[PDB]
Design an enzyme around this catalytic site. Structure first.
Site, PDB file in Angstrom:
ATOM      1  N   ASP A   1       0.925  -1.117   0.000  1.00 32.58           N
ATOM      2  CA  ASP A   1       0.000   0.000   0.000  1.00 32.58           C
ATOM      3  C   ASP A   1       0.982   1.186   0.000  1.00 32.58           C
ATOM      4  O   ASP A   1       2.116   1.052   0.483  1.00 32.58           O
ATOM      5  CB  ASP A   1      -0.822  -0.057   1.294  1.00 32.58           C
ATOM      6  N   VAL A   2       0.579   2.332  -0.539  1.00 32.22           N
ATOM      7  CA  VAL A   2       1.482   3.476  -0.583  1.00 32.22           C
ATOM      8  C   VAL A   2       1.336   4.457   0.577  1.00 32.22           C
ATOM      9  O   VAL A   2       2.254   4.589   1.391  1.00 32.22           O
ATOM     10  CB  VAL A   2       1.342   4.240  -1.923  1.00 32.22           C
ATOM     11  N   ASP A   3       0.184   5.120   0.665  1.00 32.85           N
ATOM     12  CA  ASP A   3      -0.062   6.111   1.712  1.00 32.85           C
ATOM     13  C   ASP A   3       0.010   5.528   3.121  1.00 32.85           C
ATOM     14  O   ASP A   3      -0.760   4.627   3.473  1.00 32.85           O
ATOM     15  CB  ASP A   3      -1.432   6.775   1.519  1.00 32.85           C
TER      16      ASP A   3
ATOM     17  N   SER B   1      -2.456   1.631  -4.867  1.00 33.77           N
ATOM     18  CA  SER B   1      -2.964   2.777  -4.134  1.00 33.77           C
ATOM     19  C   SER B   1      -4.251   3.322  -4.711  1.00 33.77           C
ATOM     20  O   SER B   1      -4.508   3.198  -5.905  1.00 33.77           O
ATOM     21  CB  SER B   1      -1.910   3.885  -4.134  1.00 33.77           C
ATOM     22  N   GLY B   2      -5.057   3.914  -3.837  1.00 31.68           N
ATOM     23  CA  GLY B   2      -6.297   4.534  -4.254  1.00 31.68           C
ATOM     24  C   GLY B   2      -5.911   5.944  -4.652  1.00 31.68           C
ATOM     25  O   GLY B   2      -6.757   6.767  -5.006  1.00 31.68           O
TER      26      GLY B   2
ATOM     27  N   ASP C   1      -1.198  -0.461   6.025  1.00 30.32           N
ATOM     28  CA  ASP C   1      -1.559   0.031   7.344  1.00 30.32           C
ATOM     29  C   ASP C   1      -3.035  -0.023   7.685  1.00 30.32           C
ATOM     30  O   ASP C   1      -3.386  -0.019   8.863  1.00 30.32           O
ATOM     31  CB  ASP C   1      -1.106   1.483   7.489  1.00 30.32           C
TER      32      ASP C   1
HETATM   33 CA   LIG Z   1      -2.610   3.252   3.436  1.00 29.69          CA
HETATM   34 CL   LIG Z   2      -1.290   9.735  -4.534  1.00 31.41          CL
HETATM   35 CL   LIG Z   3      -5.105   3.391  -0.648  1.00 30.33          CL
END
Ligand SMILES: [Ca+2]
Ligand SMILES: [Cl-]
Ligand SMILES: [Cl-]
Ligand SMILES: [Cl-]
EC number: 3.1.3.3
Length: 205
Positions: free
Chosen positions: A16-18, A93-94, A163
């Site tokens: 996941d990115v964020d 990622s969203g 996360d």
């Molecule tokens: Ca996240």
């Molecule tokens: Cl982004």
């Molecule tokens: Cl996301």
């Protein structure tokens, strides 16, 4: 050792990115550069947020050049070790491709391995919407991406690392899930995940 045994058995790892690979949240940063932080279904939520932001191509370009995200301590070394062992690494990622591809480039993750939303712009650069056909544009997008990866490459052990709840919910179809609280601990994930870490070094066995 159990955690590391599992982690090392993976032939593909999706991050996941964020709040996982980076400390911030892409869309949050974009909102700031556009000056709408104060004013700030998944698809419906995304449309609403972007409706207020209405980021122009120039503004996205600004974000990338002026405010690059901060990679979480240890992720560069962890991805480096994974790639040296030929483990296929993906970013899901969203958030948005334009931003996520820059994070991917810093980690030597090919763009083919990045799954995120795509912003649209008119000829003059004005916000024109986003690609609603992307798996990441709808709820459960992370799981859908992993399903597609399994159908394309037939990975025997694909692990999701993230996360939040959306990450934990990506297993299944992922074969395992490792929660990450190095930046912020989401208690619901920590209490329910079978595997959970707060520092990527722990995987650096
Ligand atoms: Ca996240
Ligand atoms: Cl982004
Ligand atoms: Cl996301
Ligand atoms: Cl984009």
């Amino acid at each position: 050792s159990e955690l590391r045994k599992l982690f090392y058995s993976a032939d593909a790892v999706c991050f996941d990115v964020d709040s996982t690979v980076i400390r911030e949240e892409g869309i949050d940063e974009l909102a700031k550069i556009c000056g709408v932080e104060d004013a700030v279904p998944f698809k419906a939520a995304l449309t609403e947020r972007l409706a207020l932001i209405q980021p122009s191509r120039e503004q996205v370009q600004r974000l990338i050049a002026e405010q690059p995200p901060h990679l979480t301590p240890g992720i560069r070394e962890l991805v480096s070790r994974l790639q040296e062992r030929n483990v296929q690494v993906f970013l899901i990622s969203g958030g948005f491709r334009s931003i996520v591809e820059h994070v991917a480039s810093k980690l030597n993750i090919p763009a083919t391995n990045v799954f995120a939303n795509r912003l649209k712009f008119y000829f003059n650069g004005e916000y024109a919407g986003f690609d609603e056909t992307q798996p990441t544009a709808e709820s459960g997008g992370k799981g859908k991406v992993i399903k597609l990866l399994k159908e394309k490459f037939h990975f025997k052990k694909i692990i999701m690392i993230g996360d939040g709840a959306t990450d934990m919910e990506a297993c299944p179809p992922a074969d395992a899930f490792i929660g990450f609280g190095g930046n912020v601990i989401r208690q619901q994930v920590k209490d329910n995940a079978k595997w959970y870490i707060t520092d990527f070094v722990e995987l650096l066995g």
